[PDB]
Amino acid sequence: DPDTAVTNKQSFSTDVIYQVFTDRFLDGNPSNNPTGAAYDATCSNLKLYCGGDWQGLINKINDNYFSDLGVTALWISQPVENIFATINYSGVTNTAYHGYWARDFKKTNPYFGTMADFQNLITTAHAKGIKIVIDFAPNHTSPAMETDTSFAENGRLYDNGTLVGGYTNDTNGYFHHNGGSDFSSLENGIYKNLYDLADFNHNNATIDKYFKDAIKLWLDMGVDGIRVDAVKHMPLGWQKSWMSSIYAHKPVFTFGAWFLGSAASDADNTDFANKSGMSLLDFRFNSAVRNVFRDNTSNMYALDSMINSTATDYNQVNDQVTFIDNHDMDRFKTSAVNNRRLEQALAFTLTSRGVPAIYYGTEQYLTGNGDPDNRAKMPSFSKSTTAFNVISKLAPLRKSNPAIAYGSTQQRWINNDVYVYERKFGKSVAVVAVNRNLSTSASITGLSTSLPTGSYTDVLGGVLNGNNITSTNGSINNFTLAAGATAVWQYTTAETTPTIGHVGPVMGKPGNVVTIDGRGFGSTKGTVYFGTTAVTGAAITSWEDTQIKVTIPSVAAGNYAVKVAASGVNSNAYNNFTILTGDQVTVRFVVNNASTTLGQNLYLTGNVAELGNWSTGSTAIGPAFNQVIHQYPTWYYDVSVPAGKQLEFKFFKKNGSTITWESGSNHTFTTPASGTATVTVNWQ
Ligand SMILES: OC[C@H]1O[C@H](S[C@H]2[C@H](O)[C@@H](O)[C@@H](O[C@H]3[C@H](O)[C@@H](O)[C@@H](S[C@H]4[C@H](O)[C@@H](O)[C@@H](O[C@H]5[C@H](O)[C@@H](O)[C@@H](S)O[C@@H]5CO)O[C@@H]4CO)O[C@@H]3CO)O[C@@H]2CO)[C@H](O)[C@@H](O)[C@@H]1O
Ligand SMILES: [Ca+2]
Ligand SMILES: [Ca+2]
């Protein structure tokens, strides 16, 4: 199978995701619509159900709406059963139309469809070459009040119909009872309730098992990707452990939502994208794009700066999911925002690095500020808008041109309003020119690119006032970039030498199968390198010119670079691949009497790669927490660690460059074969 095929569940770099609120798209089956005060046929009260379902999505796939648009993947609302109760917030009636108020993760939402309808969605989608990504929110259940069991459904959780427990009289401790978060710190937002939503205690063995079992169900049904909700509100450790169980079963592209207000670098966000095992929604990319094209609060330099900065911060920048807007912010289009600006933002996103996602209705210039106005019903299915055209012409390029899907990014020409960047992967090139100025054209001179000698036509065909250019060994002849113009020029050819464009997933234990996408691998099975270790023969389950499926070797756990050798020639190295010791379990390390100095933090390290292999650098675990579950001088932290292994570890204090280790002998602990555990020790 090509890296391009719909069967590639491990990489979305060549795809274009279409995010849609199932309820607000198309009601293909009115028979499953809710009744009473929870429904609104006219869909004017955006807090109620409008009727949209999976049958509606099926209908639009069959009548080629998505195929003509060019999108190759659908990101739908959480498919699990949500609460049925209606909630009254200060006079206004609220429903679980969004799918975020789950009550049973092992059953479907009857309003969206039956288990059979879902299977029908998967089948119909894969037939037309479209992948299905689902929303999954393992952080909480639904709104709840501990003192009032009559409010909503008391955040009750069900296991395929069987009641597990509710928020009140939670003797088993399935949920956190530490009040609501004030968002003052990372720790505060992880162990306290997100508003009134009942927060799960993933340290509980039953809850841990439940989510591993629950996700396997949906994976087994054929889902191609997972968008994890509120990753910033659950321990990285548990999530990493959960992630490894998924990758050991049926690996699929997984990304999470870690909200960011600006394009500025955030330490915790970067660590998560680099250490969790999943990528993230690129909010930094989003901010820059909006500041420049929408709000006019930044110029083209802020755009180039963001490109360079994110490529530096994230180990795998191509795995970050880009977008111009979504359900968490105001629609890109506003009366003060021109159609051309939205169109340019799209063109930019579609030709830039990462995995592009389009919020439903963007092609129809849908407006709407804040929740719930930004989740209005699809106004029409017109295929004649300029935005629709841009997407249908640029989206396919992610499949046909590897420069756009796997390439690096380099600035070629720039000023306050003009931006010319180049995507390059091997001998394939793509050059995009953008002039955000709506009234003045720009005279471009001295433009140098990697385009071979020849005449290039605008891939957009001039719909965005693009023009044709002429190359003479890279040097482009002088031309005028029209007002509000944006053009795309490309060049593609076959690769003779091996070039790795993507590896998915980037974390796993020996025995797992990983996918390597690229160009020039040849038909004859060669050899795959994980550092120095060579993998050949049966270990390589599949080998083609554009994709290689290989089994992770039994080597020491650690960070490795991946390389491919075909016909004696070595390819480029794909860095930062994490090999685990084996199966993972989440363990809470608790240390008592660890009093510190001002600005001094407590960290943890031990004899396994998951603990940093006695390192005190960035691979060490920490800084530890000391406010919610346990209070200072007691510290704690949830860590994904190998199952059934005898571990040795020690805590250490670190302020500046001074390290203070625990005295005495190392602490020891044998981890459980599965689930979770808590190990408490005293600072030596
Ligand atoms: O304080 C009392 C409070 O009562 C209600 S608030 C009430 C609201 O009216 C309802 O609409 C409903 O909101 C839910 C949304 O409709 C639903 O889509 C999700 S939103 C989801 C986000 O998508 C996700 O980003 C994350 O939250 C993000 C924020 O979006 C982001 O801006 C920043 S601040 O980071 C956050 C975390 O990273 O998680 C949420 C939750 O899944 O759920 C919400 C919550 O249910 O329900 C709320 C209360 O439950 C009154 O309206 C208020 O006036 C009043 O103050
Ligand atoms: Ca319906
Ligand atoms: Ca939480």
For ligand 2, a single-atom ion, which residues have Cβ within 5 Å?
27, 29, 32-33, 51, 53
Confirm or reject: Cβ of 196 under 6 Å from ligand 1.
yes
Question: Cα dihedral sign for 566, 570, 576, 579?
Answer: positive
Confirm or reject: Cβ of 281 under 6 Å from ligand 1.
no
Beta bridge partners of 414: 419
Q: What is the identity of the amino acid at 522?
A: G
For ligand 3, a single-atom ion, which residues have Cβ within 5 Å?
139, 199, 233
Query: Hey, which bits of 253-382 come out as E strands?
Result: 253-256, 279-280, 321-322, 355-359
Confirm or reject: Cβ of 140 under 6 Å from ligand 1.
no
Confirm or reject: Cβ of 375 under 6 Å from ligand 1.
no
Query: Per residue in 384-421, is it b (16+ CB within 10 Å) or e — as a string?
Result: ebbbbbbbbbbbebbbebbbbbbbebbbbbbeebbbbb
Q: What is the identity of the amino acid at 56?
A: G
Confirm or reject: Cβ of 215 under 6 Å from ligand 1.
no
Question: Cα dihedral sign for 8, 326, 387, 379?
Answer: positive
Confirm or reject: Cβ of 540 under 6 Å from ligand 1.
no
Confirm or reject: Cβ of 350 under 6 Å from ligand 1.
no
Residue 347 parent element (H or E): helix 339-351
Confirm or reject: Cβ of 151 under 6 Å from ligand 1.
no
Distance of CA 187 from the midpoint of ligand 3 (Å)? 9
Confirm or reject: Cβ of 98 under 6 Å from ligand 1.
yes
Measured by CA distance, the residue closest to atom 2 of ligand 1 is 195
Distance of CA 266 from the midpoint of ligand 1 (Å)? 22
The answer, yes or no, to whether the previous bond of 452 is cis (omega within 30 of 0) is: no
Q: Alpha carbon of 161 to those of 24, 82, 155, 158: distances in Å?
A: 27, 12, 15, 5
Nearest atom within ligand 1 for CA of residue 98 = 18
Measured by CA distance, the residue closest to atom 52 of ligand 1 is 89
DSSP-assigned letters across all residues of 648-666 = EEEEEEESSS-EEE--SSP
Residue 345 parent element (H or E): helix 339-351
CA 147/CA 169 separation, integer angstroms:
10
CA 547/CA 644 separation, integer angstroms:
35
Nearest atom within ligand 1 for CA of residue 258 = 38
Give the DSSP letter of residue 266: -
Tokens 């195929």, located at residue: 67
* Helix boundaries (H) for 147-289: 186-191, 205-220, 236-249, 267-275, 283-289
CA 224/CA 355 separation, integer angstroms:
14
Confirm or reject: Cβ of 197 under 6 Å from ligand 1.
yes
CA 279/CA 504 separation, integer angstroms:
11
Strand order through the sheet with 513-519: 499-504, 513-519, 547-551, 542-543
Distance of CA 195 from the midpoint of ligand 3 (Å)? 11
Confirm or reject: Cβ of 229 under 6 Å from ligand 1.
yes
Confirm or reject: Cβ of 100 under 6 Å from ligand 1.
yes
Confirm or reject: Cβ of 373 under 6 Å from ligand 1.
no
Find the largest Cα–Cα distance for the chain.
76
CA 550/CA 499 separation, integer angstroms:
16
Q: How many CB atoms lie within 10 A of CB 544?
A: 14
Residue to mutate (ligand 1; options 328, 369, 373, 374; most atoms within 8 A of CB): 328
Q: What is the identity of the amino acid at 613?
A: N
Confirm or reject: Cβ of 328 under 6 Å from ligand 1.
yes
Q: Judging by beta carbons within 10 Å of its beta carbon (0-12, 13-18, 19+), is residue 599 exposed, middle or buried? A: exposed
CA 422/CA 431 separation, integer angstroms:
5
Confirm or reject: Cβ of 232 under 6 Å from ligand 1.
yes
Ligand nearest to the Cα of 98, by number:
1
Distance of CA 34 from the midpoint of ligand 2 (Å)? 8
Confirm or reject: Cβ of 495 under 6 Å from ligand 1.
no
**Method of determination used here:** X-ray
Q: Judging by beta carbons within 10 Å of its beta carbon (0-12, 13-18, 19+), is residue 299 exposed, middle or buried? A: middle
Q: Alpha carbon of 145 to those of 149, 163, 197, 593: distances in Å?
A: 7, 18, 9, 35
DSSP-assigned letters across all residues of 567-582 = TTEE---EEEEEEPSS
CA 252/CA 223 separation, integer angstroms:
8
Distance of CA 359 from the midpoint of ligand 2 (Å)? 21
On the CB side of 635, how many CA atoms lie within 13 Å of its CA?
A: 21
Confirm or reject: Cβ of 94 under 6 Å from ligand 1.
yes
Distance of CA 637 from the midpoint of ligand 3 (Å)? 14
Strand order through the sheet with 408-414: 408-414, 418-425, 428-435, 486-491
Nearest atom within ligand 1 for CA of residue 143 = 50
Residue to mutate (ligand 1; options 371, 373, 374, 375; most atoms within 8 A of CB): 371
Distance of CA 321 from the midpoint of ligand 1 (Å)? 22
Confirm or reject: Cβ of 91 under 6 Å from ligand 1.
no
Distance of CA 40 from the midpoint of ligand 2 (Å)? 11
Give me the domains of the chain, ranges plus CATH numbers: 1-400 (3.20.20.80), 401-494 (2.60.40.1180), 495-580 (2.60.40.10), 581-684 (2.60.40.10)
Distance of CA 177 from the midpoint of ligand 1 (Å)? 19
Measured by CA distance, the residue closest to atom 10 of ligand 1 is 94
Torsion of CA 192, 193, 194, 197, to 10 degrees: 160
Q: Say if residues 125 and 117 touch (Cβ distance below 8 Å).
A: no
Distance of CA 193 from the midpoint of ligand 2 (Å)? 32
Beta bridge partners of 481: 442
Phi-psi map region of 446: left, alpha, beta (phi>0 left; psi -120 to 50 alpha):
left
Tokens 């498919």, located at residue: 79
Q: Say if residues 244 and 580 touch (Cβ distance below 8 Å).
A: yes
